[model samples]
Target: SSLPMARYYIIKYADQKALYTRDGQLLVGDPVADNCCAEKICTLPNRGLDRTKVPIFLGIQGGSRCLACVETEEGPSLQLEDVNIEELYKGGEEATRFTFFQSSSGSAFRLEAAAWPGWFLCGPAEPQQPVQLTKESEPSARTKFYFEQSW
Candidate 1:
């Protein structure tokens, strides 16, 4: 295969809250108490410019889903849609691609929309808030995250 094998990871926000899908929207919060709904697993491909840069696909209930960046009425936002990166790359759907930014000091990283440069995926300080995109690059913006292997 031209593409690298997919690696499964659990995404945790800067506050240590894992990312989960609630009512079809991505949010940061504690895992379900009774384990009713499992945490969302990020399916990452190893192909990119470097370890600090890579594309990700989120999977829930063992099914793959694309993380799409769109211009919502509110602003630039992220949504889960039924698009494949392979097809997106072929069709030039830049919004369907995202890249990670990691620092040399820590394992933490941030996600930037490929199409919308400088705009990063962010989680709010308040729990259960929808995951969104922000132009703010400050470390305090809650854009930092940790990726733990789900194996």
Candidate 2:
């Protein structure tokens, strides 16, 4: 029997910042670091709620694993969680589900929280910051990203 290979990717902000995990949190910064923390593996698992959207899973390349998630306290906040991918895939918690929206040009992408409408995944222009969730989608630059496939 044969099966299709799972997809892997390296996510970068439009400005060329790469994503890496630390303390179970996804951070945006330089991709070139002496420590192995610089590299991360991202997966867009199949069977998303919306066929038009992309479901994302991000984990350290050779370390811990976590799913990009949102925690709604005052509003929606971007966070990460350690959970079983299979369990989450089967009608799992809404907050754990995130989807990516591609722009018309087909280069940049925007990530949004599936549970929280109008909230999107964003990060700071400066380096060494945790990825954040924003309510504004009109200012597309803040939410734009590059999902470069690795294999």
Candidate 3:
């Protein structure tokens, strides 16, 4: 837990698929890339004069597949809408740039929406479930995301 991150790395969820729909719905599809309907790969921002602003298209392979969107009945839910240009604390983007912080206790990491600090990118419980932002914690199923150490 004391080891610092060497630099930056790409993120990938373990054996899961995000069934993203243009119709305003998200589901956990097959884990295989081809079988899944959603995926946001790793990318980085350009270093012009500021070096702080991340780019939209020039970022990484996995940005954010599950975006923040308001579920009229379920509160805040994750969707596959507007991920191309997501606003902070806002939901339902086609892609999003996330800032990740490694967990203090384990190999887990906490992913915060770069534009929005009020919430984080989390997965809900079970298959055919959803990925969304949340202020709550626990259960571990929704708060953590995984990626390879070297890839």
lDDT of 2 by residue, 89-140 (tens): 4434452454333333357767666666677778775555778888884757
TM-score, per-candidate, Cα-based: 0.72, 0.73, 0.44
Local lDDT at 128 for model 2? 59
Rate residue 26 of model 3 by lDDT.
Answer: 44
- lDDT of residue 123 for candidate 2: 74
Q: Is candidate 2 or candidate 3 better by TM-score?
A: 2
Q: How displaced is residue 12 in candidate 1, in Å?
A: 1.0
Please report, as a residue range, the 10-residue window in candidate 3 with the lowest summed lDDT.
54-63
- Candidate 3: Cα lDDT at 122: 70
Clash counts for all predictions: 0, 0, 22
Q: What's the true lDDT of residue 81 in model 1?
A: 71
Each model's lDDT: 0.61, 0.59, 0.41
lDDT of 3 by residue, 51-146 (tens): 343322211223334243444454444445344322222323333333322342166555555444445567656655556677645535566666
Which stretches in model 1 have alpha-carbon errors above 4 Å? 1-4, 33-40, 46-53, 84-105
What is the C-alpha lDDT profile of model 1 across 34-84, one tens digit per residue?
243546464644244344566554545443556777776776777777755
